[PDB]
């Protein structure tokens, strides 16, 4: 069995190996990358996502989200307070302001310590989930706006034609902006490219151990757990590495830098934070190996998780017994 300790693997594809996306995902899996839940892919030196980032300041962040925390430093939830619209240029200025800028630090490890110590005492503002792409149309390799769609994958594998579309999203971050512990919708893969700026630290639980994380989370968030049998789908709960280690939960951590891709694998729980002003792009995707995960994915039916249009068909076809209850939670 490859990668039996479920370590995060890092890949350096050549330009030739960078041509066929599906083939390279399958290669990484052949080497056990998926056992970690997360892999890093460093693009060949010849590749670029686009020529420059000099002309992105006029992008609009229609609903910046202030991430307000409640709890204790290692175990907290966050809610998102909507803020007035602002451009990327306005948001970058804000991120670099004395109130929000990254503090002086020695290295990533020092910064990680400061994050876990101090995050709850601040409310950083995140430009998340903005539909769009920063890949140049002429970038032919690993262009996250030109991937094969999940609808087409389900059709190829299962023969059923469904409605829905699959497009990427931009994330503009700042120091302490936080992504809560989650798996993807329908336990899909995700791919994330850090276009520019400061790093993103990730934490991940191996898919084979995901239920250990869920059990801890039910313990640590007992009201939320009573509210919903899949409350991590709400994407609001944070647990620190110290707390995970205290409770024996297997996990790994890595920092993504600008110019690097990360792939999350089906049912790989992940969480993390940004080091300073940055811009990432991400999208969900599927492969044939995902289908069995999609069929087994938990679902939130309490009303909180509310998701895209395109999840309807996935539920309806892969999880017909759950469909009626899930759809009630959508409505
Ligand atoms: O970058 C972020 O804020 C969150 N990204 C992801 O959860 C992802 O790419 O799957
Ligand atoms: Mg612009
Ligand atoms: Ni994710
Ligand atoms: Zn719920």
Q: How is 28-96 classified by DSSP, letter by letter?
A: HHHTTGGGGSEEEEPPPTT--S-S-STT-TT-EESS-EEEEEEEETTEEEEEEEE---EEHHHHHHHHT
How deeply is 115 buried, as exposed, middle or buried, from its count of CB atoms within 10 A (0-12, 13-18, 19+)?
buried
198, two tokens:
């400061």
68, two tokens:
């307000």
Structural domain including 133 reads 1-331
Q: Is the CB of 192 under 6 A from ligand 1?
A: yes
Ligand 4 center to residue 330 CA distance, Å? 10
Number of domains within the chain: 1
Experimental resolution (Å): 1.5
173, two tokens:
């971050």
How far apart, in whole angstroms, are the C-alpha atoms of residue 330 and residue 301? 7
Could you tell me the CATH number of the domain that includes residue 36?
2.60.120.650
Q: Is 10 helix (H, G, I), strand (E, B) or coil?
A: strand
57, two tokens:
């300041």
CB 213, CB 157: distance < 8 Å: no
- Residues with Cβ within 8 Å of 258's Cβ and at least 6 positions away in sequence, in order, are 194, 195, 196, 197, 198, 199, 278
Alpha helices in 186-310 (DSSP H): 210-220, 222-227, 241-246, 290-296
Residue in 249, 299, 292, 300 with CA at minimum distance from that of residue 271: 249
Mutate to test the pocket of ligand 1, among 272, 274, 279, 286 (most ligand atoms within 8 A of CB): 272
Distance, CA of 290 to chain centre? 17
How far apart, in whole angstroms, are the C-alpha atoms of residue 21 and residue 18? 7
Q: Which helix (H) or strand (E) holds 112?
A: helix 108-118
Ligand 4 center to residue 80 CA distance, Å? 16
Ligand 4 center to residue 145 CA distance, Å? 30
Q: How is 157-189 classified by DSSP, letter by letter?
A: HH----------EEEEE-TT-EEEEE--GGG-E
> What are the residues facing 71 on neighbouring strands?
76
Alpha-carbon distance values, 208 to 154, 191, 248, 263 (Å)? 24, 20, 14, 17
Tallying the residues shown for the chain, one arrives at 331
- Residues with Cβ within 8 Å of 146's Cβ and at least 6 positions away in sequence, in order, are 135, 140
How far apart, in whole angstroms, are the C-alpha atoms of residue 190 and residue 235? 15
Q: Is the CB of 190 under 6 A from ligand 1?
A: yes
CB 204, CB 36: distance < 8 Å: yes
How far apart, in whole angstroms, are the C-alpha atoms of residue 310 and residue 150? 9
Residue in 263, 254, 251, 157 with CA at minimum distance from that of residue 212: 251
Q: Is 297 helix (H, G, I), strand (E, B) or coil?
A: coil
Experimental method: X-ray
Q: Is the CB of 130 under 6 A from ligand 1?
A: no
């Amino acid at each position: 069995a490859q990668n039996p300790n479920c370590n995060i693997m890092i890949f350096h594809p050549t330009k030739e190996e960078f041509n066929d996306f599906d083939k390279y995902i399958a290669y990484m899996e052949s080497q056990g990358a998926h056992r970690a839940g997360l892999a890093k892919i460093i693009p060949p030196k010849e590749w670029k996502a686009r020529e420059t980032y000099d002309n992105i300041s006029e992008i609009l962040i229609a609903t910046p989200l202030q991430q307000v925390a409640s709890g204790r430093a290692g175990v907290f939830t966050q809610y998102h307070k909507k803020k007035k619209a602002m451009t990327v240029g306005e948001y970058r200025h804000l991120a670099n302001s004395k109130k929000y800028q990254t503090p002086p630090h020695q290295n990533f490890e020092d910064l990680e310590r400061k994050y876990w110590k101090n995050r709850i005492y601040n409310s950083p503002i995140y430009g998340a989930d903005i539909s769009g792409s920063l890949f140049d149309e002429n970038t032919k390799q690993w262009n996250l706006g030109h991937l094969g769609t999940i609808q087409d994958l389900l059709e190829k594998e299962c023969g059923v034609v469904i409605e829905g579309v699959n497009t990427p999203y931009l994330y503009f971050g700042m120091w302490k902006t936080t992504f809560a512990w989650h798996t993807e919708d329908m336990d899909l893969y995700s791919i994330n490219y850090l276009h520019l700026g400061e790093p993103k630290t990730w934490y991940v639980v191996p898919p084979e151990h995901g239920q250990r994380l869920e059990r801890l989370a039910r313990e640590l968030f007992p009201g939320s757990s009573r509210g919903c049998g899949a409350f991590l789908r709400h994407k609001v709960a944070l647990i620190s590495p110290t707390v995970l280690k205290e409770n024996g939960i297997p996990f790994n951590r890595i920092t993504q830098e600008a110019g690097e891709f990360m792939v999350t694998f089906p049912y790989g729980y992940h969480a993390g934070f940004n080091h300073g002003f940055n811009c990432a792009e991400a999208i969900n995707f599927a492969t044939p190996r995902w289908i069995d995960y999609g069929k087994m994915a938990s679902q939130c039916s309490c009303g909180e998780a509310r998701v895209t249009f395109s999840m309807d068909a996935f539920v309806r076809i892969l999880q017909p017994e759950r469909y009626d209850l899930w759809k009630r939670g959508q409505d």
